[PDB]
From a paper:
Lipocalins are small proteins, usually composed of less than 200 amino acids. Yet for the lipocalins whose structures have been determined, they have a common tertiary structure consisting of an 8 stranded antiparallel beta barrel with a hydrophobic ligand binding pocket. There are 7 sequentially named dog component allergens, Can f 1 through Can f 7 and 4 of them are lipocalins: Can f 1, Can f 2, Can f 4, and Can f 6. Therefore, Can f 6 is a major allergen driving disease amongst those people who are allergic to dogs.
The recombinant Can f 6 crystallized in space group P3121 with one monomer in the asymmetric unit (ASU) and was refined to a resolution of 2.06 Å. The overall architecture of Can f 6 contains a highly conserved lipocalin fold of an 8 stranded anti-parallel β-barrel enclosing a central ligand binding cavity core, a four-turn C-terminal α-helix that packs against the β-barrel, and a short 9th β-strand (βI) at the C-terminus. There is a disulfide bond between residues Cys69 and Cys162 that connects the C-terminal part of the protein to the central β-barrel. Can f 6 crystalized as a monomer reflecting the method of purification, on size exclusion chromatography at pH 8 where the protein of correct size was identified and further purified. The PISA analysis of the Can f 6 crystal did not reveal any specific interactions that might result in the formation of a stable quaternary structure in solution. In the structure of Can f 6 there is unmodeled electron density inside the highly hydrophobic ligand binding cavity which is uniquely shaped. The calyx cap conformation in Can f 6, places Met40 of the L1 loop over the ligand cavity where it does not make significant internal interactions. IgE reactivity verifies the antigencity of recombinant Can f 6.
Numbering used by the authors: 6 to 165
The structure:
């Protein structure tokens, strides 16, 4: 049951796994990239806030970080502060299997967008994955800038 709007935030809480990562600036999502983070779980703080738990590599070690995200005026949109100011929203989700996030980072230097595909399990059908790829292309993210994380160290060995 795909959902493209009016999302039940409580039903996207819990564990997620970071499968595909995309950006119009590839350095942001390659190794050592400011945006190469691996989601661990999403939880509802309040009627209007979220807390993301994610892993990043710090001196070679998987390291847990927390990010507070607040709902904004536009529906489904959130904002967060990681290497600049970020606005993100759900593109679509199947609550039990996958979710697609679009993020926009606005900074002094150079504005850029992010696309992320999470799964309830460390992978999803290639049907879901290429719907994601077509999304990225429609948003003019080059296919060269889409990274499959299923075959990289995404800190799964550190989720607890």
């Amino acid at each position: 049951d795909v959902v493209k709007g009016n999302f039940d935030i409580s039903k996207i809480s819990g564990d997620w796994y970071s499968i595909l990562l995309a950006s119009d600036i590839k350095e942001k999502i390659e190794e050592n990239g400011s945006m190469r983070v691996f989601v661990k779980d999403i939880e509802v703080l309040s009627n209007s806030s979220l807390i993301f738990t994610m892993h990043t590599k710090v001196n070679g070690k998987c390291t847990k970080i927390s990010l507070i995200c607040n709902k904004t005026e536009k529906d489904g949109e959130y904002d967060v502060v990681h290497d600049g100011y970020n606005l993100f929203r759900i593109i679509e989700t199947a609550y039990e299997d996958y979710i697609i996030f679009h993020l926009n980072n606005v900074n002094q230097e150079q504005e850029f967008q992010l696309m992320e595909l999470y799964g309830r399990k460390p992978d999803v059908s290639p049907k879901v994955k290429e719907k994601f790829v077509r999304y990225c292309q429609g948003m003019e993210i080059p296919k060269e800038n889409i990274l499959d994380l299923t075959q990289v160290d995404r800190c799964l060995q550190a989720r607890q």
